[PDB]
Structure 1
Amino acid sequence: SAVRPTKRIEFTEADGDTEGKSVFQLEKETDKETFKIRDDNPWVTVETNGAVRVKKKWDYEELGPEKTIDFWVIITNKYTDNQRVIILVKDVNDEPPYFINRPLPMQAVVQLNAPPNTPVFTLQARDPDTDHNIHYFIVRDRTGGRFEVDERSGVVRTRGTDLFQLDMEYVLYVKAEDQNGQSTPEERLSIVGGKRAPQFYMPSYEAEIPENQKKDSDIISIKAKSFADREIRYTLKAQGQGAGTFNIGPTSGIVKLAKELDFEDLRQPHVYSLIVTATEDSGGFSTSVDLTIRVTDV
């Protein structure tokens, strides 16, 4: 027949990242066949010998919604053959955006007399694909319409002139969506009127240290965010065993080893459970978090 079975083949965007690179060889039914493209294609040239070469550096986003380099070839040696070539192009960078806001869950405060269009928090997601653009939006507003999000910047801004209530929680569920390839999870943003307690940069902390850890060496750094941007004082208590084995820097949040350790001494536990407290001298507010320290033998 005049038409050959359609050549189907899969390559990544990156396989086509260099002009003139021979991606694949089109097969010939007879030794003396020569190839020629039917229509000029922006992405590929076809050599006389059937080698398919990168013309313009492949860009998945720039392909039609089909995501294929789709072209025909003429085969000869008139009595000529025709064959369709469909290169399915895979965008291997195309993985969903994720929020890079820290700490999670998303927490902000709103000034009680915040005037309209006061920014209270900036949503920041990252698309691992550098070639993608994302839009931020609210999927569920539990604030009674007191906040909106800028789709470009991710900035969350107050609306209306009414006051906000002290200690009152305003909740938005927010999402960033890809304009190319997927989205973030629908994350919960908690905005509290006026002030709220410090939030640790991790919901729990875990350290693993050898038996021979040097006395007064740093074991783990703990940090809490003060929403009032006020001074944080850290304290550390032991849950059960190990009181006084570790301390934490009042200002630094750095947990050091206070005592020598013996793994073969069964008086000392192998897993220490500690609670770190972050205290604002901004008045009252404290938050606690678990710190778990495991000791390995050496």
Structure 2
Amino acid sequence: AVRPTKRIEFTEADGDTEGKSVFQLEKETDKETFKIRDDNPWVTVETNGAVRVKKKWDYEELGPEKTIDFWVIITNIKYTDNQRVIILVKDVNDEPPYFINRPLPMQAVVQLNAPPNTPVFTLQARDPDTDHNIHYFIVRDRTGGRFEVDERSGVVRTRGTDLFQLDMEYVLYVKAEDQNGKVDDRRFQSTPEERLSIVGGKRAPQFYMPSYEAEIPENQKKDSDIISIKAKSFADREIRYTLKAQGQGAGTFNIGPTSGIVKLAKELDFEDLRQPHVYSLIVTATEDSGGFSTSVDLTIRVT
């Protein structure tokens, strides 16, 4: 038999303390013991009907309904009643913002004679709460006032009429704040401090990941697609992709020079001791509109 469902409201912050009791289910008789029907990540049920925080409540990790929804078995006349409990959980601003810029680290060029207020980069941050209010800031300026960032748009502009120097690195350290989420009476939730690299004139291409990793089983099909690798050109020149092995396994793999897709060019057999269980490869992105080239590591482990 079924008891009236218990429906109740809380902020995720009301569940900010492990083992804190948040409410108790009614007893029908005093002998009654309570057992949760299924282990729950968020709550424990005590034998007397008390409900406690298990893992700290987190609105961001709950599913679409944003509830902790569970059944409880109530044993004792000799009866075994069932009762459902639904805890509606309310969002509080409690998660820090993060940068969504890619690739990382943040990189850019600046033309040698950029007029003042030339837009050079756009900081882009998100924040997990429903209630965010993001502000962008330079925190370390190692450039002598050559750049500023718009507090709201994230746009990074040049200041001053002075020339910029070819192949010189202008470095800024930036961050975003969610000014709807305090840590104290002073400070707000923050991204990490990111280093923004601005080079005068031009610079080599950059990969979308600082290094690449793939794990495949030993029965992987020949010629099948393993992983996709992409580099960006700062002057939108054409990129040609190229691959090579550090030690063991030349020819085991190859890359489409335009797609940047890596395929398995040979059969894998763990019985064949000549074949390593870990491949160290180097992918190279060459600007084949003359000159600039960049490399990255590709590690492929086999199981």
Q: TM-score, normalised by structure 2?
A: 0.70
CA drift at 1:265: 1.1
Question: Distance in 1 between the 2:246 and 2:38 partners?
Answer: 75
- Over 3 Å counting, the alpha-carbon distance change for 1:244 and 1:107 in structure 2 is same
Partner secondary structure for residue 216 of structure 2: strand
Structure 1 unmatched runs, 5+: none
Question: Distance in 1 between the 2:56 and 2:30 partners?
Answer: 31
CA drift at 1:72: 33
- Over 3 Å counting, the alpha-carbon distance change for 1:133 and 1:47 in structure 2 is farther
Range with greater deviation from structure 2 (73-82 or 130-139)? 73-82
Q: Is the 8 A contact 1:61 1:131 kept in 2?
A: no
Range with greater deviation from structure 2 (61-70 or 206-215)? 61-70
Structure 2 unmatched runs, 5+: 182-188
- Over 3 Å counting, the alpha-carbon distance change for 1:120 and 1:82 in structure 2 is same
Question: Distance in 1 between the 2:284 and 2:167 partners?
Answer: 21
Question: Distance in 2 between the 1:52 and 1:266 partners?
Answer: 57
- Over 3 Å counting, the alpha-carbon distance change for 1:103 and 1:76 in structure 2 is closer
Match of 2:227 among 211, 220, 223: 220
Tell me how large the CA RMSD over aligned residues is.
10.4
CA drift at 1:178: 1.3
- Over 3 Å counting, the alpha-carbon distance change for 1:199 and 1:27 in structure 2 is same
- Over 3 Å counting, the alpha-carbon distance change for 1:254 and 1:73 in structure 2 is closer
Aligned residues: 295
Partner secondary structure for residue 237 of structure 1: strand
Range with greater deviation from structure 2 (45-54 or 195-204)? 45-54
- Over 3 Å counting, the alpha-carbon distance change for 1:292 and 1:57 in structure 2 is closer
- Over 3 Å counting, the alpha-carbon distance change for 1:40 and 1:134 in structure 2 is farther
Question: Distance in 1 between the 2:222 and 2:115 partners?
Answer: 52
Q: Is the 8 A contact 2:240 2:285 kept in 1?
A: yes
Range with greater deviation from structure 2 (157-166 or 12-21)? 12-21
CA drift at 1:134: 0.8
Q: Is the 8 A contact 2:213 2:298 kept in 1?
A: yes
- Over 3 Å counting, the alpha-carbon distance change for 1:4 and 1:145 in structure 2 is farther
Match of 1:52 in 2: 51
- Over 3 Å counting, the alpha-carbon distance change for 1:163 and 1:22 in structure 2 is same
Deviations 1:58-117 (A, max 9, x none): 999999999999999999999999999999997455200011111111111111111111
CA drift at 1:259: 0.6
Q: TM-score, normalised by structure 1?
A: 0.71
Q: Is the 8 A contact 2:91 2:130 kept in 1?
A: no
Match of 1:131 in 2: 131
CA drift at 1:272: 0.6
Match of 2:9 in 1: 10
- Over 3 Å counting, the alpha-carbon distance change for 1:24 and 1:283 in structure 2 is same
- Over 3 Å counting, the alpha-carbon distance change for 1:48 and 1:214 in structure 2 is closer
Question: Distance in 2 between the 1:20 and 1:76 partners?
Answer: 23
Match of 1:180 in 2: 180
Q: Is the 8 A contact 1:112 1:166 kept in 2?
A: yes
CA drift at 1:36: 34
CA drift at 1:51: 17
Q: Is the 8 A contact 2:93 2:132 kept in 1?
A: no
- Over 3 Å counting, the alpha-carbon distance change for 1:59 and 1:97 in structure 2 is closer
Question: Distance in 2 between the 1:76 and 1:264 partners?
Answer: 58
CA drift at 1:129: 1.0
Partner secondary structure for residue 30 of structure 2: coil
Deviations 1:162-218 (A, max 9, x none): 111110000110011111110111111000001111111111111111112111111
CA drift at 1:249: 0.6
Q: Is the 8 A contact 2:145 2:159 kept in 1?
A: yes
Partner secondary structure for residue 15 of structure 1: helix
Question: Distance in 2 between the 1:135 and 1:237 partners?
Answer: 44
- Over 3 Å counting, the alpha-carbon distance change for 1:153 and 1:59 in structure 2 is farther
- Over 3 Å counting, the alpha-carbon distance change for 1:108 and 1:26 in structure 2 is same
Range with greater deviation from structure 2 (11-20 or 49-58)? 49-58
- Over 3 Å counting, the alpha-carbon distance change for 1:5 and 1:136 in structure 2 is farther
- Over 3 Å counting, the alpha-carbon distance change for 1:187 and 1:32 in structure 2 is same
Range with greater deviation from structure 2 (172-181 or 78-87)? 78-87
CA drift at 1:50: 19
Structure 2 matches for 1:186-197, cutoff 5 A? 186-197=193-204
How much identity, in percent, do the aligned residues show?
A: 100
- Over 3 Å counting, the alpha-carbon distance change for 1:27 and 1:180 in structure 2 is farther
CA drift at 1:266: 0.6
- Over 3 Å counting, the alpha-carbon distance change for 1:101 and 1:72 in structure 2 is closer
Question: Distance in 1 between the 2:273 and 2:36 partners?
Answer: 78
Deviations 1:31-65 (A, max 9, x none): 99999999999999999999999999999999999
